[PDB]
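We modelled each protein-ligand pair independently. The example shown here corresponds to the VDC entry; the chain sequence is given first, followed by the ligand as SMILES.
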Amino acid sequence: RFHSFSFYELKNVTNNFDERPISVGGNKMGEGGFGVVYKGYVNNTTVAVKKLAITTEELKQQFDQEIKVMAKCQHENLVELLGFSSDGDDLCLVYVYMPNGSLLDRLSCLDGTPPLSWHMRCKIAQGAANGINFLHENHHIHRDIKSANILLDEAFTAKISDFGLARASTVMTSRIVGTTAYMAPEALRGEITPKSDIYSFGVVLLEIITGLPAVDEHREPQLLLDIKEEIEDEEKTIEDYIDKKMNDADSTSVEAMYSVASQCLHEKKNKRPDIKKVQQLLQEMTA
Ligand SMILES: CC(C)Oc1nc2nn([C@]34CO[C@](C)(C3)C4)cc2cc1C(=O)Nc1cccn([C@@H]2C[C@@H]2F)c1=O
């Protein structure tokens, strides 16, 4: 069901992979560890084209791993692969365009976008949990859950992205991959489990509550997961950290979200809630 592109087609529709940012008149919209994301225009449709940039064989394995997961993983809250380019030296993945970009950039109001309302933040968290539930229900571990990997369409529907590190689902690995500021302690040690996705989602819930990135070079505490200490050690309250760029943050619902995040962020994996419980708790917050 995926359209095979020749590489030259993608070169043509991405202004020959103009690496300049969109604002500078280029085609680059963002980047990750595994490739650079470009805006493309194919058959009157705006698309996202990720050109993959780790040993070369491993890059191909991740390329195909995204294809295999995407082939079986279709959901409202998962980004949709449209096609690929495997011919040529470079590897390309073509996705449905997401007009409102990443949750990370929207939380930071990048490029002048308005602050997200608390009501929309709750819907986004629910949508993201629905996507993770689909992955876990179909026996997949994302392994890179983070706000940069939660994309938003024109209606701000949340869509989980980047299944290159995804795995089927005790099991350990020589390769520790992920985003350290979001990873569970067991994941930092090479353990591979769906419970590590829950911990990373807890950091995301914290980013949503506070509007702060998971790590900020010029910030103390520099890691957001550390603020869970100040709350439990009574050094600070969740009030002190609630994003001030909001006018509709009911205290009860916000404290409800911190509770879900706190449970997700227990260092012991087996004490973490499962995704269905996380779904249930998040639904109960808006009820
Ligand atoms: C987060 C970055 C990397 O992506 C985007 N940023 C955007 N910023 N803006 C706007 C518009 O007006 C603004 C003020 C600037 C917001 C629109 C965007 C669309 C995207 C996009 O469609 N991005 C992906 C779609 C599908 C998949 N993947 C995964 C990487 C794999 F391919 C994507 O990254």
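The pocket of VDC is lined by residues 29-30, 37, 48, 50, 79, 93, 95, 97-102, 111, 113, 151, 161-162 (CB under 6 Å).
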